[PDB]
Structures are given as structure tokens and as C-alpha cells.
């Protein structure tokens, strides 16, 4: 595509510049260009891909929720609120389909190490989750199953291959727990997964260095914040 003429190293360098400039649409276009070079991503490069698209879809999701709330109020006027909510929805769907397409071409297929495979399957679950947030009816059921499946494959590798404090494993469990609570209408599964994840990580903190301890405890605090909200 449009980044085909740029060197892979220049795309990564410009993604970092775009992050510093808070230009996340540019950051995502540069990282898409880097993925489309066909080579595997390093840990740092996977992080850049995730930061870029999380910030782009996060603005879309925030805007969709504001518009959905106004639309719900207006149905308790004209077609304009629905049309504009639909416009933002379609743009958000397009960003999710773009990320899913990168994961399917061919990041997950080539990812053999647990840290890369769990990261990408988690991201697959997250973007199907964002599709599920705006989906209705039977469409919704198949999208929810696609999220659940990706998260479950990621969970099964993470429990076999990573210690319970590994930040990737922790963030997966955090997000799968949010899936269960908000998407799958399974609050008890959400609370059980957050509590078991927190308790198993607590028992493994003794093994960590100061820096690894700070990384793991930061994510554990998010689990605790959700358990406080839910119980």
C-alpha cells in the first residue's frame, strides 16, 4: 500500500516520532506499513503496533459511546443522530477489520514463541471485543464467539508457557475478564478469573527483580480495581 516505498527501519523510526507527537493515526499507518513488509515484529515493534491502534480505536469507541447515548435519549427529531453514529461505527469497524487483517496476514501464522503468539491472540480477542461492543443480534453472537475463541487459545498457551506474573499473561487475563463481564454477560466468570489471576501472581512476586515487580504489580492493581468495582 501507500507505505510500500518506505524502508522498514524508517517506518519504525517514524512510528516512534508519531508517538512522541501524539499523531496516532500516522503511527498506525507507519506500523501497518511495517507489518506489510512481511517480517516478524520484535517485542518493541509489537508494542508500537498496539499503542498506535489502541489510541486510534479508543477515540472511535469514546465517540461512539457519546453518540449512542444521544441516540438512545432521542428514542425514549430526524435521521442525523443515527446517520452520524453509523458513520463513526463504520469507521471503527474498519479499523478493527484492518487490525484483524494484519493479525491474519500473517502475524499469528508466523508467531511461534509464547510471548509473540499470546500477544497477537490477545489482540485478536480485543478487536473482536470492540466489534462486539457495537454489534447487534446474531451478528453479535458470531463476533462474541470469535473474541472468546482467540482469548481462550491465548489463555491456554499463557498458562502452559509463562509464569503467573508475566505482564502479557496478566494483561490477557485482565482483558478476558472484561470480556466476560461486559460482553458475555458472565460477571461471575469475570470475578473468578480476576481473583485467581491476582492471587496466583501475588504468590510468584517473590521471584521478580525490582523492575519486573513494578511491571507485574501495575497490572495487578487494574485487576484489583475491577474486583473493587464488581464486588
Amino acid at each position: 500500500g501507500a507505505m510500500g516505498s518506505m524502508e522498514r527501519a524508517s517506518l519504525i523510526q517514524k512510528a516512534k516520532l508519531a508517538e512522541q507527537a501524539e499523531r496516532y493515526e500516522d503511527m498506525a499507518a507507519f506500523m501497518k506499513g511495517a507489518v506489510e513488509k512481511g517480517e516478524e515484529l520484535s517485542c518493541e515493534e509489537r508494542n508500537l503496533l498496539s499503542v498506535a491502534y489502541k489510541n486510534v480505536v479508543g477515540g472511535q469507541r469514546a465517540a461512539w459511546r457519546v453518540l449512542s447515548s444521544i441516540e438512545q435519549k432521542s428514542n425514549e427529531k430526524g435521521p442525523e443522530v443515527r446517520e452520524y453514529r453509523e458513520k463513526v461505527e463504520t469507521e471503527l469497524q474498519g479499523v478493527c477489520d484492518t487490525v484483524l487483517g494484519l493479525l491474519d496476514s500473517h502475524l499469528i501464522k508466523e508467531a511461534g514463541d509464547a510471548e509473540s503468539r499470546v500477544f497477537y491472540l490477545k489482540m485478536k480477542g480485543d478487536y473482536y471485543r470492540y466489534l462486539a461492543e457495537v454489534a447487534t443480534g446474531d451478528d453479535k453472537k458470531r463476533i462474541i464467539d470469535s473474541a472468546r475463541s482467540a482469548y481462550q487459545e491465548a489463555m491456554d498457551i499463557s498458562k502452559k508457557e509463562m509464569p503467573p506474573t508475566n505482564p502479557i499473561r496478566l494483561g490477557l487475563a485482565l482483558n478476558f475478564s472484561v470480556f466476560h463481564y461486559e460482553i458475555a454477560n458472565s460477571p461471575e466468570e469475570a470475578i473468578s478469573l480476576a481473583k485467581t489471576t491476582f492471587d496466583e501472581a501475588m504468590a510468584d512476586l517473590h521471584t521478580l527483580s525490582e523492575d519486573s515487580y513494578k511491571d507485574s504489580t501495575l497490572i495487578m492493581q487494574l485487576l484489583r480495581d475491577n474486583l473493587t468495582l464488581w464486588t
Binding site: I219, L229, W230
Partner: peptide, 7 residues
């Protein structure tokens, strides 16, 4: 209120 997913 919405729960925290990974930041």
C-alpha cells in the same frame, strides 16, 4: 461505570 482494560 466501565471496568479497566489494559492501558
Amino acid at each position: 461505570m466501565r471496568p479497566r482494560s489494559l492501558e
